Serum albumin
Amino acid sequence: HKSEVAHRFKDLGEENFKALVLIAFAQYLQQCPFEDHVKLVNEVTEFAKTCVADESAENCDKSLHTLFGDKLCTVATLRETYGEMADCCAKQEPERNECFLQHKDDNPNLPRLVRPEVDVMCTAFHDNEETFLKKYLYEIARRHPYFYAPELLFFAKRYKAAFTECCQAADKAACLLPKLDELRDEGKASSAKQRLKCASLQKFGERAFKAWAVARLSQRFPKAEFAEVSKLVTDLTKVHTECCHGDLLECADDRADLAKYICENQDSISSKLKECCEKPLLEKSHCIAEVENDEMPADLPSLAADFVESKDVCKNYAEAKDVFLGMFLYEYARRHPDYSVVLLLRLAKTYETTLEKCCAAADPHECYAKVFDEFKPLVEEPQNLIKQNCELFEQLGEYKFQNALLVRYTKKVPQVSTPTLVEVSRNLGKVGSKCCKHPEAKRMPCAEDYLSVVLNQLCVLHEKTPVSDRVTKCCTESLVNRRPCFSALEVDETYVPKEFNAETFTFHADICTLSEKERQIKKQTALVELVKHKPKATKEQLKAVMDDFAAFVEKCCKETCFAEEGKKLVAASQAALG
Ligand SMILES: CN(C)c1cccc2c(S(=O)(=O)NCCCCCCCCCCC(=O)O)cccc12
Ligand SMILES: CN(C)c1cccc2c(S(=O)(=O)NCCCCCCCCCCC(=O)O)cccc12
Ligand SMILES: CCCCCCCCCCCCCC(=O)O
Ligand SMILES: CCCCCCCCCCCCCC(=O)O
Ligand SMILES: CCCCCCCCCCCCCC(=O)O
């Protein structure tokens, strides 16, 4: 294209472009003020408008990277503030940008963004929505460099959707909070998800990713033929590589390409994309990414024909082990959108293992005749965990369910820090709440997604804060071994009950009117340490100690009750629990 910025501006919109450029600059110039970026945006935007006005206007012809880099090198505070990031400015573009990528900082070290009071927000919103949206856009972008700009934008507009919606409702907070919390969550899952997706590719391997991808793709596009799914995973793996590589523009293009490829091939891919393809370049790939599984073809055959019965299972497998395995995965996944990808991978890894084993032996067919029976222990297992957990959760609610989880895991991994156990437990509960509402069919996918994110947040938090080798194990496990390993975490019977400490167990009227979250967190962190000091305590002895608390607390909110009515709880339980 003549002038890529003219182009971009025109095929994005003034708005989207201002937002993206902001996000873009916010993401490198993470220690720069809002107004400086706004200045740059304005400086970039207006310039772009000249490039639009006339695609031949000086500097319009320049690469979106060059402009961007130049624009980055126009920031005066650039050497003082970004130090060596500024040295990038001396490098010629190909290197200049790759140098700016290097100097993007994932854990950039910023104040936690503190959700202001609704009214404050709702008013700042109403007054200067544009500034509102961008100022926070700014904060989230610089906090999340690497976080894919357009998506951030989509959260942005969803944030706008939540403010426009809630800032004119009877109870603003009753409306917004849940919504900002939804967005807060999904913003984190999405950030956590990207974090992961890039780590995934590197540690677990391009293979593992392609496998994961094929399974996903095939569940999402059952009626797509394997050659098609594979095309998509080859390209998806590429776009993915580039988005991880971090460069927004390349990445964005790659995803645009793919999305266009996928829209000019909806018939070959999915019938559920009509919606996703009528959308603008911007929303395309992301809509696509999020698209739901297409209906699988009416009455498909077992995989027994191609993977057991076929004469040439072994020949086909050996002639291209990974294509075949992908075909298995394809055929298995397409048939099972109900399975979590990793499951499919476990099944495929399994069918790979026996093929490896069998195809060598005198009679493979005999040997691998019952390979699918090996698939049941693997399918049911995580299927059971859904039934079981969604049962547990339906008999307990999000909250007491987290508490269920908390004691389960604190018992499983007592060394893990308590805030961690509280969060992963809390998030776990949340994913329980989220995926259990889902029907049996969509449950496992759903879980796996949140799960791998929860697990990964847990796992990387556990990295260089390590406390349980068994976790480091479950963390340094295979993409597919990860969750099982965890689900294989027993109670740490070598665990020495952490020595008692009254302070963690003394609470105050603080508790009675803390936000219902803080309440839960303090209760759950309490419940945790409770298990940490008394690992060996039956669901009998705990519903005991907890039903105490519950009573002990509402039968208190003259608040020195906590120092005394507390004292009793502290010693009563201590003795009761052996
Ligand atoms: C590349 N990665 C990690 C992926 C992100 C989101 C969805 C993905 C799906 S899917 O079945 O859930 N979605 C349908 C195909 C998505 C094609 C649209 C491109 C969006 C992916 C961009 C995100 C990225 O490449 O990291 C299958 C395979 C990979 C996906
Ligand atoms: C030779 N090359 C480069 C290849 C050609 C064609 C397909 C290929 C696939 S694939 O995604 O299309 N096929 C699915 C991969 C099979 C993986 C099944 C086992 C699960 C992971 C293995 C064990 C582990 O590391 O967790 C993956 C990797 C390489 C492929
Ligand atoms: C500096 C001006 C250009 C800013 C554009 C960078 C972000 C690219 C937006 C195009 C969106 C790609 C499609 C997608 O979301 O997958
Ligand atoms: C406590 C977990 C969330 C509540 C119910 C769903 C989670 C259990 C499902 C485990 C399977 C997820 C990944 C996998 O396929 O192994
Ligand atoms: C060792 C004796 C001190 C008592 C330990 C208090 C920890 C109990 C946490 C409360 C769990 C939630 C119960 C509820 O839903 O109210």
Summary: The pocket of myristic acid (ligand 3) is lined by residues 5, 8, 12, 20-21, 24, 64, 68, 149-150, 248-249, 252, 255-256, 259, 281-282, 284-286 (CB under 6 Å). The chain is about 70% helix and 0% strand. The chain has six domains: 1-105, 106-195, 203-294, 295-380, 381-492, 493-566.
